[PDB]
Each structure stands twice: as structure tokens, then as C-alpha cells.
Design a protein around this ligand. Structure first.
Ligand SMILES: O=C(Nc1ccccc1C(=O)O)c1ccc(Oc2ccc(C(=O)Nc3ccccc3C(=O)O)cc2)cc1
Ligand SMILES: O=C(Nc1ccccc1C(=O)O)c1ccc(Oc2ccc(C(=O)Nc3ccccc3C(=O)O)cc2)cc1
Ligand SMILES: O=C(Nc1ccccc1C(=O)O)c1ccc(Oc2ccc(C(=O)Nc3ccccc3C(=O)O)cc2)cc1
Ligand SMILES: O=C(Nc1ccccc1C(=O)O)c1ccc(Oc2ccc(C(=O)Nc3ccccc3C(=O)O)cc2)cc1
Ligand SMILES: [K+]
Lengths: 311, 311
């Protein structure tokens, strides 16, 4: 955990020692719809050497198939056909898995999803009916009118994911549903800001999840990184061996901390949000938790692996 | 800080040593439009005894003048006419004063207010123009469209107050405005829940302010209780003497903590949010901050002061 630059020799040693590599799609492989220069060639070379490539993302907007299509379109060489989805693990699919297990044996389970269409679709495939996907503008002169709005009959969970239609009405409805102790609170991810191309960014799902949490005085179960649950899903379907697996990430609090908590080796790409200066601040601090989110190796871009892989 | 019940004897002695009593309007004096039973008579008796009564509230929805009208309407016996407003101190008015200080020397001052009409009105009286009050529904299929929406040219502050129209578009616009370093971030209050009559509650301004804070990675300046600023505003016009002043409140984290930090004596009314068990948790805990939010006296309702006052 010394944030060593992964030079070609160091990279060759690490690559020989690891037969699986896990990546964060946003900020490592690609930004916006534009690939990080050289990243596609790097991942294709890694597949050529026989290394298993897996993808972990905190984005609830896209399904497994959609993310796989993006990776193939941009030349990261995923398997073609339906099998592609198996390679990518995202908060939407993992949220569906969490609700499948937790609400197992519940008849015709339904949930209030303050989230994207893909999240609702993944839940539907799991069998969880979804309500609340879409706009919910506020109507009423005062609080009583807002609290009077009708609610769906059987809602056993609230899923907070990226919802551009998020409103105070949705927050009030979420609180009302969550007043029942049985009702679960699920947060897709806890990212404060999410990066976009050209150094632009938009507010992160975490802002919504913290708003709902505070309003209901409940602590949500966060499916996404850095929670061990997303790693457990990957481990259930990939059979990950922590000693022989690497996590490539751009965000210290989510990706790198996932690696540290789950005993995976960590590579930090500076293409994305986090910076070497942030690592230095965490290193200097005496807090052990801050020390956890310190990467084993750092690369300017994933493309810096190409010299070793082009061997 | 032993949370002793305010018996009639204790009340008479305490009233003898204190010549000013400050109250929280919501949850102590009244809930909704329904007054706490006997409270109007208590405050009227305090006026008759000569005790100076002042009001501090975290609600940005209501103007100073409107709160005064509520006080006379419900029989709490404030001075009639314009001077009524002098008695009430609220987050809207205090926020306007804060912006008067910070935006002093600014031509045509403007702010993006995620808030009520009353908040904008108080700002307007101070001279600060308001933008964004009202619905701003999100339209557009993706992030680029949302960030392309035009913004007003001159915004030197963003004020996050209770906004029933809060939406992701308003959060994005607030983030964009706060990206300029000069732009200030002001939060009217930081309450997670606000109480309503009938034991129901809705989400608080604090949830919205925390969402904006996280999205902008900025620390908002919180005007409302327990911030020292609201007490300074009260003291500017009242000349508060801590030895002779009491704070009557229903919420430990806001009212009682203001009393402790500003060295005012504290009475807890159980009519509102906080409960004796919460006080017990703070007393038992070894955290010093929890010990700060422990009331000196506790009264079931302010009406239990009437026996001492009817003397
Ligand atoms: O919810 C969306 N749509 C709809 C909802 C209801 C009805 C119709 C639609 C309709 O698109 O017709 C939606 C969701 C997302 C949208 O863009 C985004 C694309 C990508 C991301 C993203 O990088 N996400 C993250 C990445 C890293 C870490 C966290 C996140 C996160 O999202 O928390 C975000 C938004 C557009 C429409
Ligand atoms: O989130 C809160 N609770 C919970 C969340 C999950 C589960 C349980 C609870 C549970 O309280 O059982 C929360 C707690 C307390 C809250 O009041 C507050 C009151 C005042 C302030 C405040 O002025 N703070 C600041 C002061 C000055 C400058 C900046 C700030 C700032 O906060 O930035 C904060 C919270 C609210 C929610
Ligand atoms: O009690 C209230 N507050 C608080 C009390 C204690 C602690 C915290 C808060 C706290 O708000 O954080 C309260 C009272 C009344 C409330 O109804 C409201 C209803 C409507 C609006 C509002 O913007 N309305 C409009 C805005 C734009 C355009 C039109 C309108 C309209 O009403 O036509 C605000 C508050 C909420 C909380
Ligand atoms: O608040 C954040 N920022 C700032 C705000 C103001 C000023 C400066 C900063 C500034 O980062 O300089 C913030 C930082 C990092 C954030 O990622 C996080 C991701 C996840 C969690 C988290 O609890 N993850 C959970 C996982 C499992 C179980 C429970 C939780 C839970 O959240 O309950 C915290 C931070 C977010 C905001
Ligand atoms: K960077």
C-alpha cells in the first residue's frame, strides 16, 4: 500500500501473479462514450494472454447487456452473443440479486424504485415488481395533501438509484413506505458526484440515498462499491481468488477500498476522479480507514500496461 | 444538565432568575394551526409578569410578519402592529441578514434559492434578488441536455431552504452555480424531519441541504439552530444576557444545543420531536457532544408553567 508506479517490469511481475483482473468501466476504460486512449488494446491483449477480465460498476442506469454492448462496441473484446452480460456486474443486477435473496419466499414481491428503467428491468427479471420509475411531480398546497397521496398496496422494499425524476414527493412517499419496519432500504451506490466527459460532472446517487436515509432515520444497504456485497456477487459467478485478482479503479473511496477490504490487489488509474494528491493525504493521515483506501500500484492510464503486454 | 422535571416550585424560582424566555414556535407553542393546550395563556401570563418573550424558529416557509400574525391570531399576545415582527426570528429573515453581510457591496445581488416564496420575500426586503423559486421539472434524455440548460448570469449565492419542488434539475443547477468559487452556499436549517400535527412527519430542509453539500463538495453555512449565527441575530436586536435567558424547545439537536452552546438555560418540551429516552441515551453515552444536547429542565408542555405564573 505504497502507491508504487507500475512500471513495465513491475507490471509484468504482477500480471504473471494474477490470472483475473477486475475493472471499473467509468474513468478507467472509458469516459463518456469515448474510450481512454489505448485502453481497448490493453484489455484485448490481456484477454489474449488468457487473463480473465471482469467489470464492476456502480452505475444503475444500464443493464448487463447494455454495458456489455458498450464494451464490445468500443473494442474491449467481450464475448459475443447473450453470454456477454455475464462478464459485467453492475449495481442494477446486484440490487436485483439482493432483493431476490432478502425477499425470497415473499409472494409477488413489489418495490418502490426511485431509479432508472434498467434497475426496474433487472428487478423484474428477478421477479420483483417495480413501482415509481418515472416522474412524480409535487401537487398539493401543503404537507397534509402530500401525505394524502395514494400508495401502492404491497411494497416490501425501497430502492434508491439514479433517478433524474427525483422529487420531494418521491422522498415523502419513500419515507411513508419505509415507516413499516419490514420494508427494506436499498441504495445502489453512494457516490457523491459522478464524472462525465470533458471534466463535467453531475450529482451522484449518494446524494439521493443520503436524503432518503436521513428522512427515514434508516441506514440503507448499499449494493455498490465499496460494499463487500458486489464483490460477493462477482465471486459467486466468477470464483474469484483474492490472491490472484486485481481491481483497477479511479475512485479511492469506492474501487480501491473495495480491493483493500476484499483482499484484492489494487491499481489506481489517474484518468478518473481520484488523484495522487488524494492518496498522499490519506497516506499522511493516521486514520486506519483512510490508510485502507491507499492503492498498491498506480498507473497514469490503463494503457500503461501495454509495454508489458506487448512483450 | 440533569433534565430535572420543571415542578411548579422550580418553575417559580427559574422564572424569578430569568427575565427573558425564547421559544421554538413549532412543536412547543403550536402544531399546525392547533395550539398546544394552555400554551397561549402561559405566554400571556409571562407577558403580564413582565418577562420578555422572543421566538426562534427554523422554518423558512413563513415570513417574520406572518409568524407574528399567527402569534396574535392564536392568542400568544405579541405586540400588535409592525413591532410584532421584532419578536420573531426565523431562518428566512436570519438568512436574509447573513446575505446582507456576506453580499455587502455587491451590485444587484442575486441568488439561486431552492426555497419558499417567503424566503425569497425576506431576501427581497434585504435587497437580494431571488431565482429559481418554483417548479423546475427535469426534461431531457441525458446528462448533456441537462447541463446545457441555460443559467442566469449573476448568481453569487445558493440558498437551500425547504423546497417542495426540489428536483434533480435544481440540484444540478445548484452544483453548477456553486462551481464558481465566489458563490456562497447557505442552508436555512439542517433538520432531517419536521413534525406535523397528528404524530405524522415529513422530510426536512436538512436532507436537501446535505444533497447539495455532497454534490458540490462544499460545507454550507447553516443559519438556523443550533448555529451561533441565529443567536447572534437574536442578540443583535434583543441584547440577550445568558444568565437571565431561557430556551424552550422540543428538539435536542437544534433548540437545546443552541441553549447549551450560547450559555442559555434550557427547558425541553416533550410535546414535540424529542423524548425523555433520547435524553437518557445522551446522558448515558460518554460522548461530550451528546452531553451538550441534554436539557437542564424538562416540562411535558409549556402549560405546566401556568401554576407558577398563576400564583
Ligand atoms: O432514469 C433514467 N431514465 C428514465 C427514467 C424513467 C423513464 C424514462 C427514462 C428514459 O431515459 O427514457 C436515466 C438514468 C441515467 C441517465 O444517464 C446516466 C448515465 C450514466 C450515469 C453514470 O455514469 N452513473 C454512475 C457512474 C459511476 C458512479 C455512479 C453512477 C450513478 O449513477 O450513481 C448516470 C446517468 C439518463 C436517464
Ligand atoms: O441523519 C441523521 N440521523 C439518523 C440517520 C440515520 C439513522 C438514524 C438517525 C438518527 O438520528 O437516529 C441526522 C441526525 C441529526 C440531525 O440534526 C442536525 C442538527 C443540526 C445540524 C447542524 O446544524 N449542522 C451544522 C452546523 C454548522 C455548520 C454545518 C452543519 C452541517 O451539518 O453541515 C446537523 C444535523 C440531522 C440528521
Ligand atoms: O414546519 C415547517 N418547517 C420547519 C419547522 C421546524 C424545523 C424545520 C422546518 C423546515 O422546514 O426545515 C414547515 C411548515 C410549512 C411547510 O409547508 C410548505 C408548503 C409549501 C412551501 C412552498 O415552498 N410553497 C411554494 C413554493 C413555490 C411556489 C409556490 C408555493 C406555494 O405554496 O404555492 C413551503 C412549505 C413546510 C414546513
Ligand atoms: O461528503 C462527501 N464529500 C464532501 C462534502 C463536503 C465537503 C467536502 C467533501 C469531500 O469529499 O472533500 C463525501 C465523500 C465521499 C463519499 O463517498 C462515500 C461512499 C460511501 C459511503 C458510505 O457511507 N457507504 C456505505 C457502505 C456500506 C454501509 C453503509 C454505508 C452508508 O453510506 O451508510 C460514504 C462515502 C460521499 C460523500
Ligand atoms: K484526475
Amino acid at each position: 500500500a505504497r502507491c508504487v508506479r507500475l512500471s513495465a517490469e513491475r507490471a509484468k511481475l504482477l500480471l504473471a501473479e494474477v490470472d483475473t483482473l477486475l475493472f471499473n468501466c467509468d474513468g478507467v476504460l472509458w469516459r463518456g462514450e469515448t474510450a481512454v486512449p489505448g485502453a481497448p488494446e490493453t484489455l484485448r491483449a490481456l484477454r489474449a494472454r488468457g487473463k480473465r477480465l471482469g467489470f464492476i460498476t456502480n452505475n444503475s442506469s444500464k443493464t448487463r447487456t447494455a454495458y456489455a454492448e458498450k464494451l464490445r462496441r468500443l473494442g474491449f473484446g467481450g464475448p459475443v452473443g447473450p453470454e456477454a452480460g455475464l462478464e459485467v456486474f453492475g449495481t442494477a443486477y446486484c440490487s436485483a440479486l439482493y432483493l431476490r435473496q432478502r425477499l425470497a419466499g415473499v409472494p409477488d414481491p413489489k418495490a418502490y424504485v426511485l431509479g432508472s428503467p434498467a434497475l426496474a428491468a433487472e428487478l423484474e427479471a428477478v421477479g420483483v415488481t417495480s413501482v415509481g420509475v418515472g416522474p412524480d411531480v409535487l401537487h398539493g398546497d401543503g404537507p397534509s395533501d402530500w401525505l394524502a397521496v395514494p400508495l401502492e398496496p404491497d411494497v416490501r422494499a425501497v430502492v434508491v438509484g439514479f433517478d433524474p425524476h427525483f422529487s420531494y414527493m418521491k422522498l415523502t412517499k419513500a419515507v411513508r413506505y419505509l415507516q413499516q419496519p419490514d420494508c427494506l432500504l436499498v441504495g445502489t451506490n453512494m457516490d457523491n458526484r459522478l464524472p462525465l466527459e470533458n471534466g463535467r460532472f453531475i450529482a451522484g446517487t449518494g446524494c439521493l440515498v443520503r436524503a432518503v436515509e436521513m428522512a427515514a432515520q434508516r441506514q440503507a444497504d448499499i449494493i455498490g462499491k465499496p460494499s463487500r456485497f458486489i464483490f460477493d456477487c462477482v465471486s459467486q459467478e466468477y470464483g474469484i481468488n483474492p490472491e490472484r485478482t486485481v481491481m483497477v479503479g479511479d475512485r479511492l473511496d469506492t474501487d480501491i477500498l473495495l480491493g483493500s477490504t476484499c483482499s484484492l490487489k489494487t491499481i489506481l488509474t489517474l484518468t478518473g476522479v481520484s488523484s495522487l494528491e488524494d492518496v498522499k493525504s490519506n497516506q499522511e493521515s493516521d486514520s486506519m480507514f483512510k490508510k485502507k483506501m491507499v492503492p498498491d500500484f498506480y498507473v497514469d492510464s490503463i494503457a500503461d500496461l501495454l509495454p508489458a503486454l506487448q512483450g
